[PDB]
Amino acid sequence: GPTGTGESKCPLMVKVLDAVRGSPAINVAVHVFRKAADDTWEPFASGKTSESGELHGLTAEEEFVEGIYKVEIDTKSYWKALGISPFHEHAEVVFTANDSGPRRYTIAALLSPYSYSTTAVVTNPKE
Amino acid sequence: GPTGTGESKCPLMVKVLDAVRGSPAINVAVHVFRKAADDTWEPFASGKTSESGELHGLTAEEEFVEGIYKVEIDTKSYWKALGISPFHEHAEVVFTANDSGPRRYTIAALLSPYSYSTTAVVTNPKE
Amino acid sequence: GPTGTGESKCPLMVKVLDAVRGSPAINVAVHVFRKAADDTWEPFASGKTSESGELHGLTAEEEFVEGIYKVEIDTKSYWKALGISPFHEHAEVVFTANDSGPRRYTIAALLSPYSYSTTAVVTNPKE
Amino acid sequence: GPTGTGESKCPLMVKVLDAVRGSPAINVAVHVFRKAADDTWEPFASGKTSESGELHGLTAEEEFVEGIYKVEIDTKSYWKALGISPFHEHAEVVFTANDSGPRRYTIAALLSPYSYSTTAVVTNPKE
Numbered sequence: 001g002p003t004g005t006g007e008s009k010c011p012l013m014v015k016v017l018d019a020v021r022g023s024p025a026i027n028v029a030v031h032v033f034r035k036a037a038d039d040t041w042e043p044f045a046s047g048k049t050s051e052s053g054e055l056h057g058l059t060a061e062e063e064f065v066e067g068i069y070k071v072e073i074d075t076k077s078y079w080k081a082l083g084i085s086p087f088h089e090h091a092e093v094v095f096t097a098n099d100s101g102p103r104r105y106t107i108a109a110l111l112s113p114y115s116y117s118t119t120a121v122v123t124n125p126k127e
Numbered sequence: 128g129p130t131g132t133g134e135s136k137c138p139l140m141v142k143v144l145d146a147v148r149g150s151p152a153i154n155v156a157v158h159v160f161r162k163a164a165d166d167t168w169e170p171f172a173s174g175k176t177s178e179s180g181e182l183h184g185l186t187a188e189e190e191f192v193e194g195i196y197k198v199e200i201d202t203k204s205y206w207k208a209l210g211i212s213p214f215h216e217h218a219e220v221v222f223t224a225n226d227s228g229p230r231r232y233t234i235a236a237l238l239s240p241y242s243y244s245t246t247a248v249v250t251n252p253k254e
Numbered sequence: 255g256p257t258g259t260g261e262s263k264c265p266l267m268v269k270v271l272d273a274v275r276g277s278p279a280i281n282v283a284v285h286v287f288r289k290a291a292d293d294t295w296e297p298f299a300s301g302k303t304s305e306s307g308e309l310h311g312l313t314a315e316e317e318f319v320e321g322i323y324k325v326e327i328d329t330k331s332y333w334k335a336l337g338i339s340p341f342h343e344h345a346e347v348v349f350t351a352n353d354s355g356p357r358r359y360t361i362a363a364l365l366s367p368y369s370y371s372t373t374a375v376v377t378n379p380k381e
Numbered sequence: 382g383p384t385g386t387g388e389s390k391c392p393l394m395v396k397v398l399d400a401v402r403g404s405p406a407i408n409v410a411v412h413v414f415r416k417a418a419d420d421t422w423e424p425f426a427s428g429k430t431s432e433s434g435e436l437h438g439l440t441a442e443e444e445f446v447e448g449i450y451k452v453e454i455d456t457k458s459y460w461k462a463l464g465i466s467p468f469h470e471h472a473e474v475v476f477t478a479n480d481s482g483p484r485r486y487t488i489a490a491l492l493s494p495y496s497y498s499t500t501a502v503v504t505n506p507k508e
Contacts, residue, residue, distance in 0.1 A: 094471060095470060114502075115500035117498035145495075239373075241374045249368075
């Protein structure tokens with residue numbers, strides 16, 4: 001099933017949707033990075049979306065400390081897999097994670113060949 | 128808890144999000160209509176979004192027959208409730224429901240004061 | 255400027271884009287209605303987007319009085335003429351206009367088969 | 382036309398809009414990078430959006446060669462100057478350009494504090 005660096009009560013979740021087919025975007029590769037002290041993007045977690053277009057178990061709460069994170073979504077592979085030429089090489093979401101703010105982070109991405117929209121839902125409850 | 132005309136294995140679900148606060152849009156009124164024989168919008172189901180920004184139990188499968196449906200979202204009340212002047216009177220989603228197509232319908236709406244995006248996810252599994 | 259029904263400084267303009275092809279949505283039919291005293295939609299103006307995906311000259315400043323307007327974009331025909339059976343019947347934007355004096359409104363829509371985004375840009379004329 | 386680094390027919394243009402105020406996003410800093418032979422991002426061009434939310438003259442057609450480019454929009458500064466702590470650090474659009482000959486690219490972004498949409502309009506020059 002879905003997983004990542006550390007499957008636990010998801011502090012970070014990714015949901016990807018397909019605006020052309022009206023369906024979840026399945027088997028889409030997602031790579032998470034953490035900005036290191038030297039400003040380089042340290043690999044953090046990675047995975048592929050499930051049949052429901054979701055990626056959970058990426059990280060556990062112990063290791064999800066405040067910092068700058070980058071979620072890279074391989075949208076090009078996805079569109080190539082459907083016979084459609086896309087515009088973007090990938091879609092990235094860069095944000096800061098702070099403790100004062102709600103605990104859970106859901107990054108949602110809605111995809112089209114020449115356009116993508118992303119939203120963040122920060123909460124306290126589950127999902 | 129959440130409900131509507133007939134709470135069952137949700138053939139139709141609504142999910143509303145707030146792009147300004149990064150949270151689900153709670154207590155948002157949603158009215159569903161069915162185009163009648165005389166082309167008027169017959170009231171069909173209605174409700175308010177839950178704490179998770181979702182509305183389920185709107186209809187049951189027996190009564191969700193092929194037809195043209197309209198989902199009206201009272202976005203103006205929502206923004207007025209936050210001290211923000213919105214542009215739209217409401218957001219409507221009009222679509223045809225056909226049996227050949229997947230069984231489940233999830234209408235998602237992402238809201239901002241002067242802009243809204245809506246997507247449909249049509250599937251066979253749950254959600 | 256252009257009184258009667260022309261377009262003084264063009265108070266109402268529509269811009270449609272295609273998220274699947276990365277281009278303006280050409281020849282999209284647009285119908286505008288104004289809410290009449292009797293609470294019914296009265297035909298106000300109509301046209302089709304140009305090669306640039308824009309629609310100008312829908313109304314003159316003199317006739318564009320305060321009121322509730324509905325801009326209906328025939329998205330279904332557009333996608334069908336491309337061989338795609340889309341989800342929505344059309345896209346509708348309903349808003350109150352000119353309540354605090356005359357303004358210039360630009361309604362933009364970004365189209366995908368199972369999704370659409372709309373935003374409004376409201377300017378205060380200066381000439 | 383304008384060779385060197387000006388803008389012949391303006392091959393690269395950025396348009397930024399604000400979904401919370403219903404207006405162009407003025408004075409937004411934009412940085413463009415090109416992927417160098419060594420797989421590192423090299424500074425290619427930069428500027429700020431005008432009162433219309435547009436950024437023109439970033440490059441000339443002669444210097445806008447085939448390559449992978451990254452358009453970085455400083456969304457964080459924009460929202461902060463408005464008193465809002467937004468979710469994202471910035472918005473980045475990465476794409477391959479001019480691989481099948483020269484084209485005109487228009488990168489559009491619609492901004493909200495916890496969300497952004499981006500689309501591309503690619504035109505084939507004729508003059």
